[PDB]
Amino acid sequence: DMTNMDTRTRHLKVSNCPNNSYALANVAAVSPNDFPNNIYIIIDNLFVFTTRHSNDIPPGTIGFNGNQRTWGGWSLNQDVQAKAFDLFK
């Protein structure tokens, strides 16, 4: 259910993926304080990913894998903009 969620923009640092399992899932691992669980979030208004709660990632940080960085051309510790996404609208 995506009807209600905080859409406020957040600036998050790109860091190494926590482990291979998270990279395999291809889901943005976020802290519970960052965003709700199992919701679609857009980044830079271009890159959409599904959020999953992760306690190993501190609030205010976003985890990415190598392929996602290659798609976005991002380096480690790079700052990116994240917002809530609504594909249906």
């Binding site: 190494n16 190598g66 380096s75 480690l76």
Partner: protein, 284 residues
């Protein structure tokens, strides 16, 4: 010639501060400390260094900080000269503190660079050497001595990369690139800088950052764009992207055949190949 032991004994006798009732009739103790320091200087390689150290301590007690720093420099000279690296390091530390407290950050930086050299070569205290080199480069930059700060930063980045701090070494290499840009005098240094930076970024498994660095160097420095270092860095980036360790080894051999590699690069690429092996371990 006077006996140095007798001179040191006389200096110690004169070096006793006035105490109690005598202090009400004895003048300033500075003169006694000065005389003891002069006697110690006369008496004073390891024994001579110890005696300079005593003279410097007496000079500090006398308020002559500059003379104390000079005597500490002489003590450092002779301790290093006697193979006593620890006492030389101590003497350099006191001299550096004296000079910095007096605003002579140039002298402090020079002797800090010497101290870092001593730590790196004689005592193998690589962390302290890195700290000394970083501080010396910073002070040289505050004096606008671009080349000396650049040398200190080269040493600091080399040691940091050898120490497992690839990101910090790459940052220092970026600082070196920015400082040396536009200077006709440091261009090859730049040609290498870019390469080294990329290598560090590749030791950190950040192939994207290495590619960004290669592109920046190619677009910013025409000399680097056509340099073999640029081609070698691109080949290394491609090899890491494809995960072909053997291709990386072949590229390294090709690069060595025309431009001999150094132990720093050897270590970086060895860690990179072991990282490919670790990825192969993660592959299972």
């Amino acid at each position: 010639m006077s006996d140095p032991v007798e001179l040191l004994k006389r200096a110690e006798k004169k070096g006793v501060p006035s105490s109690g009732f005598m202090k009400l009739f004895s003048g300033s103790d500075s003169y006694k400390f000065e005389e003891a320091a002069d006697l110690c200087v006369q008496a004073a390689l390891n024994l001579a260094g110890d005696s300079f150290l005593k003279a410097a301590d007496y000079q500090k007690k006398a308020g002559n900080e500059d003379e104390a720093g000079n005597t500490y420099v002489e003590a450092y000279k002779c301790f290093k000269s006697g193979g006593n690296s620890v006492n030389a390091v101590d003497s350099l530390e006191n001299a550096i503190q004296i000079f910095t407290h007096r605003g002579q950050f140039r002298r402090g930086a020079n002797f800090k660079f010497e101290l870092g050299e001593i730590l790196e070569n004689d005592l193998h205290d690589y962390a302290k050497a890195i700290d000394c080199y970083e501080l010396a480069g910073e002070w040289y930059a505050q004096d606008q001595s671009v080349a000396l700060s650049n040398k200190c930063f080269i040493k600091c980045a080399d040691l940091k990369a050898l120490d497992g701090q690839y990101i910090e070494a790459s940052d220092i290499y970026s600082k070196l690139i920015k400082s040396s840009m536009g200077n006709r005098l440091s261009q090859w240094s730049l040609k290498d800088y870019f390469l080294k930076k990329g290598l560090c970024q590749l030791a950190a498994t950040d192939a994207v950052a290495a590619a960004r660095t290669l592109q920046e160097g190619q677009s910013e420095d025409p000399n680097f764009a056509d340099s073999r270092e640029s081609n070698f860095l691109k080949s290394l980036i491609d090899a890491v992207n494809e995960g072909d360790s053997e291709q990386l080894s072949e590229h390294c051999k090709e690069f060595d055949n025309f431009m001999r590699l150094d132990k720093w690069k050897i270590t970086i690429l060895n860690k990179i190949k072991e990282s490919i092996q670790q990825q192969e371990d993660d592959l299972l």
